[PDB]
Design a protein around this ligand. Sequence first.
Ligand code: MYR
Length: 10
Amino acid sequence: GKVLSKIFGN
Ligand SMILES: *C(=O)CCCCCCCCCCCCC
């Protein structure tokens, strides 16, 4: 959701 961009690593 909004974490949705870290657990995306890179
Ligand atoms: C929001 O919509 C995504 C939330 C990010 C953390 C939990 C979702 C996990 C599903 C995405 C797979 C990413 C690698 C586990």
